[PDB]
Amino acid sequence: SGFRKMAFPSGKVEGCMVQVTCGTTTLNGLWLDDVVYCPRHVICTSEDMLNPNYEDLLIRKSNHNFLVQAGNVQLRVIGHSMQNCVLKLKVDTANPKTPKYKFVRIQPGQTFSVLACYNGSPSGVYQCAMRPNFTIKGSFLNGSCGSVGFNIDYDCVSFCYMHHMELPTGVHAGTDLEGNFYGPFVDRQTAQAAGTDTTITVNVLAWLYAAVINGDRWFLNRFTTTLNDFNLVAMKYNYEPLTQDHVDILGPLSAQTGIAVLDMCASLKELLQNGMNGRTILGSALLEDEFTPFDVVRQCSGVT
Amino acid sequence: SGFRKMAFPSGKVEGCMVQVTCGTTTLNGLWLDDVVYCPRHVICTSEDMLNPNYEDLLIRKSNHNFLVQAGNVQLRVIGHSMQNCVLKLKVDTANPKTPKYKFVRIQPGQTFSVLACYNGSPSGVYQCAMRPNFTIKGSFLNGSCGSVGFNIDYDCVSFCYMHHMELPTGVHAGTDLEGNFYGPFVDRQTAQAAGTDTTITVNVLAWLYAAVINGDRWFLNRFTTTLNDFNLVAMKYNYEPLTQDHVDILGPLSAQTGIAVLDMCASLKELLQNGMNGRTILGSALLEDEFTPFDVVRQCSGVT
Ligand SMILES: O=C(Cc1cccc(Cl)c1)Nc1nnc2ccccn12
């Protein structure tokens, strides 16, 4: 029992973190096989970030200008290329700690763990989600760029995020491992505002199922609703529309608890309309949306 | 910017997790040097847990009855001993992945990371605190016993907790690595209720400082208070008494923000008396008490 915002064990990813320096900029790189991935803005000076032409800036850079250090030992760079907003630095040595891995591009609402790093060294691990506005609510300081987001399935690490930027509102933007940003963000020091940060409805419902499994049941009511009626309420409260696909994904949690998905929707509808009334659910005084249905099942079953 | 419930990177501890089986019970062990530490209740059957005499039960056990598996390879047990509520299994091989380490006994209010494990395999990592009633609010299922709690200082892992038990209220109890339980709990299936779970005042104030550093400032008011006046309010709300030692530990956060500790106490006093009024602080609708002043400084400075 008990329900926590749990991250994946980070060891497999710690073994991949390296430091990359170009000129006077130092950030993090991810070393998998004989390639080191890092944000392309490592080639930029402070003045370059306002309006950078990355292709032009990269012409002035050679393999020997990219300093890559793995722990206390230097890696030899034998090639470099730009793929979208990331640089791929080919080194002469395969990372002996390379886990089984995949590069995945996640959808909004999906969660992942972040290993925050500075100077190629891990500082901490936390769980977060790709918001519906394509930002992440992370905890990153200067030097954290190149820190990665990932999920693990037994022995395979699926890398889904690389940190690039902090918006003026304190929210974070980054790319997948192919260097494509999530959302409309660009790697430039320019006016980039985030859209509406709506609540991930399917995740809230999964977390309400987690609460029932753990004994917090005060919010269960005698009501039911329909997808259309629920969705009218969800629109009013800036919650994402619930689809039949979301209902289907909640099937195993509905089966485990015996609470029909639409009945849980009616409980969520009353919580939105009436508030918590000073009460808590799973130690939270607000409705938590950064646990997916898969996360709830995984945590409640003990998948290693 | 951004503030998250962040755990230490878990790799150094993942390299120490092993599976221990005695009879039909399987739980986790911690392998450091040539010793494997695990809860002594691994020797108990389901019927033994009601009123176990551990010394008597242990007489019927020999080295070959403790099966220790590190990954897929079996460790040879060449000695066994009971130290308080833990068993120390001497194996013939030093763990080649043993990090620099210490065993520490923490005080209530102190935080640590937990690497939840099943069958010697890591499932997840989360941050928690030793509650003032000596329980922890973890996320543990059957098979999680022997999972450990730890803090890391650069390269040294300080182990502070080993999971032993879940109370009937869904809260968790365990020992330090010398096998002494935190609080009055015993490793028996018996009536053990937890005391008042008071709020860790010094941690709430540290988290209010973290909020100011990250831009959440709505709760700052025009008031001040004294330690004695504040403590009258803290008693009323089941908050721990704030001492001058706590004020001193908050000094660096007071210096960074320019907000005197007693002024922050007055802000906390108004939050206790008036509530949040439907507002949030650092994405929370309640006052968070599982970040110590050291955690706030560490996260806000990027210590690796
Ligand atoms: O935002 C930047 C630098 C940058 C500026 C403009 C565009 C790009 Cl791609 C990168 N670095 C960064 N990332 N997280 C944090 C957190 C705190 C301070 C700086 N942070």
Ligand SMILES: O=C(Cc1cccc(Cl)c1)Nc1nnc2ccccn12
């Ligand atoms: O509580 C026990 C077994 C036990 C019973 C009585 C005394 C002792 Cl020392 C140990 N195991 C356990 N620990 N965390 C969880 C979580 C879910 C189920 C069981 N859990």
